[PDB]
Amino acid sequence: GSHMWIGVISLFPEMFKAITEFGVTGRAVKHNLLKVECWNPRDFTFDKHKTVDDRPYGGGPGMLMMVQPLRDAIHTAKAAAGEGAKVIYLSPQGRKLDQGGVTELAQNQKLILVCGRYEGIDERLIQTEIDEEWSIGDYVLTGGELPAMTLIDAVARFIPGVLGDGLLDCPHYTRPEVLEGLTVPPVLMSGHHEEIRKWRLKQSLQRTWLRRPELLEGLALTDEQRKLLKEAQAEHN
Amino acid sequence: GSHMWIGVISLFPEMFKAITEFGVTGRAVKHNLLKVECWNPRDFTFDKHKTVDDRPYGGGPGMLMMVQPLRDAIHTAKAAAGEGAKVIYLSPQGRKLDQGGVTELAQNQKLILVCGRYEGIDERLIQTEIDEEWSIGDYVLTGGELPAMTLIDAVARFIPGVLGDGLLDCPHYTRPEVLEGLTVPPVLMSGHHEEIRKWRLKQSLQRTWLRRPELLEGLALTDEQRKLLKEAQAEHN
Ligand SMILES: NC(=O)c1ccc(NCc2ccccc2N2CCOCC2)nc1
Ligand SMILES: NC(=O)c1ccc(NCc2ccccc2N2CCOCC2)nc1
């Protein structure tokens, strides 16, 4: 319906099986709400040894991706996407991913995700081939594959059919009623819907407050939420 | 040598092939610097339909992981790890992952990673079975598998043998010398090692400053770095 097409440039396309063949993302794929198409720069080399890396100008420890096979793979993917596909490079230098960014990215019907390996890609390719850099967080990984997959899984949740607000989740409980002495909170057994809604909300406000206070600053809380937050805080002191 | 053992509890162990069979992490695995062992809660069920989910107390939209098969899988993994294994739950409510956290986590020789599906796990299991909650970032995914894999890849980089400071990376360049009109910066061709070191460092300082200014506040810059930052800023105005 409002499905999504995602192109992937990667030296390890088979990695993407982790999201295409399992769980919710796997189902989204099989029901054609999500399409993940991979192009491997190795297929675009011409030398006998299928070389995909190259030496950094200026010396240095590592390698970069070799420009020609990487550039060609990107062009082929763009031609498959038609007009309107946004090309994203996953990197530490990129805009930090958060839920607002995920909802932004989900608006696009077509994405091309370029996954860096070695010490990354030539600076000039970013300028000519890439629309936006994104980071999933302030940490270094061996490849852009996992951040690509992470991005894909996150936006996939916003596609209609795939499934069935500033705050951390409340605690959840299932069977049994007593577990290693710990009991389930009586309000959740009471059956009183509205009392349950308020407890969960208070919990979220309390949990957000104690674990991630800065998240509360971005929010314009409701009167109810202000009340429920004030209460939780009173009970804490 | 200083190898690492990682236990994984997951309804989709085959997802972990993305890191165990490819690239640098794949090599670390094959050379026995890294070991990733999976236990699937589905194997610990006893009913005919191998049920791994259960109904939330208090009503609500989704399901949680069923406590018994999840709890049993965790216990089996702990017994495989012996003493000293830290059990981590990947979740949005967790401590935010960043490089400092990765270097912290890398200190452990044994990790058990519990991957939530559905609306997650019973609150009481966190209290009894989990040592630390971690988040890879402020975004929601369909499973803890990708955040687990992300964690694994990140700490793996700190194991000796696996491979060959507050700032974003400098630009990188490889062949050709001219690409769509864009040339490689002459300093990188000059062969002057020390001039090259300073340019790369200035770039990092400039890039960090323009993209992620707050990262600069955490740092106690060197005199050189203060000088190189001041310069970059002068040239910007
Ligand atoms: N946080 C993220 O979004 C993220 C993304 C990728 C990534 N690695 C891929 C990568 C991409 C771009 C540049 C360098 C690199 N790396 C190459 C391998 O060496 C480290 C540098 N790491 C983290
Ligand atoms: N940022 C992270 O580290 C991260 C980790 C996991 C994750 N999802 C697994 C999960 C784990 C715990 C609780 C709920 C859930 N989810 C179940 C699926 O529905 C959403 C809630 N998402 C993001």
- How far is B215 from B167, CA to CA, in rounded Å? 7
Give the C-alpha distances (Å, rounded to integers) separating A101 from A135, A157, B30. 10, 13, 37
Q: What is the DSSP letter of B42?
A: G
**Interchain proximity B137–A136, CB inside 8 Å:** yes
In this complex, the residue of B57, B145, B156 whose CB is nearest that of residue A188 is: B57
Best probe of the A interface among B96, B102, B172, B201, by most A CBs < 10 A, is B172
Let me know: does B20 contact B36? Beta carbons within 8 Å. Answer: yes
**Interchain proximity B122–A25, CB inside 8 Å:** no
CATH fold of the domain at A165-237: Trp Operon Repressor; Chain A (1.10.1270)
A57 touches chain B (CB under 8 A): yes
The response to whether residue B144 sits with its C-beta less than 6 Å from ligand 2 reads yes
Q: Cα of A74 to ligand 2 centre, how many Å? A: 32
- Relative to the CA of B116, which ligand 2 atom is closest? 11
Let me know: does B156 contact A99? Beta carbons within 8 Å. Answer: no
The response to whether residue B61 sits with its C-beta less than 6 Å from ligand 2 reads no
Instruction: Please enumerate in sequence order all residues whose Cβ is within 8 A of that of B5, keeping only pairs 6 or more positions apart, or say none.
Output: B35, B37, B81, B85, B109, B110, B111
Q: What is the DSSP string of chain A?
A: ---EEEEEE-S-GGGGHHHHSSHHHHHHHHTTSEEEEEE-GGGG--STT---EEPPTT--SS-EE-HHHHHHHHHHHHHHH-TTPEEEEEEEEEEEP-HHHHHHHHT-SEEEEEE--TT---HHHHHHH-SEEEESSS---S-SHHHHHHHHHHHHTTSTTS----SPPPP---S-SEETTEEPPGGGTS--HHHHHHHHHHHHHHHHHHH-HHHHHT----HHHHHHHHHHHHHH-
Q: Cα of A16 to ligand 1 centre, how many Å? A: 17
SS3 at position B50: coil
CATH of domain B1-164: 3.40.1280.10
The amino acid occupying position A187 is V
Residue B99: which H helix or E strand, with range? Answer: helix B99-106
- How far is B24 from A149, CA to CA, in rounded Å? 17
Ligand 1 binding pocket mutation candidate from A89, A136, A141 (most atoms within 8 A of CB): A141
* Cited resolution, angstroms: 2.6
- Relative to the CA of A137, which ligand 1 atom is closest? 1
B18 touches chain A (CB under 8 A): yes
A201 among annotated binding-site residues: no
Checking phi first, is residue A6 left (phi over 0); if not, alpha (psi -120 to 50) or beta?
beta
Neighbouring-strand partners of residue A112: A7, A87
Ligand closest to B168 (CA) is 1
Let me know: does A88 contact A131? Beta carbons within 8 Å. Answer: yes
- How far is B45 from B119, CA to CA, in rounded Å? 19
Instruction: Name the closest-CA residue to atom 3, ligand 1.
Output: A135
- How far is B81 from B110, CA to CA, in rounded Å? 7
Domain ranges of chain B: 1-164, 165-237
Name the one residue in this structure whose structure tokens are 């989910």: B53
Quickly count: other Cβ atoms within 10 Å of residue A237's Cβ: 4
A187 among annotated binding-site residues: no
Quickly count: other Cβ atoms within 10 Å of residue A195's Cβ: 14
Instruction: Please enumerate in sequence order all residues whose Cβ is within 8 A of that of A36, keeping only pairs 6 or more positions apart, or say none.
Output: A6, A8, A16, A19, A20, A29, A152
The response to whether residue B150 sits with its C-beta less than 6 Å from ligand 2 reads no
* Pairing relationship of beta strands B178-179 and B53-54 according to DSSP bridges: unpaired
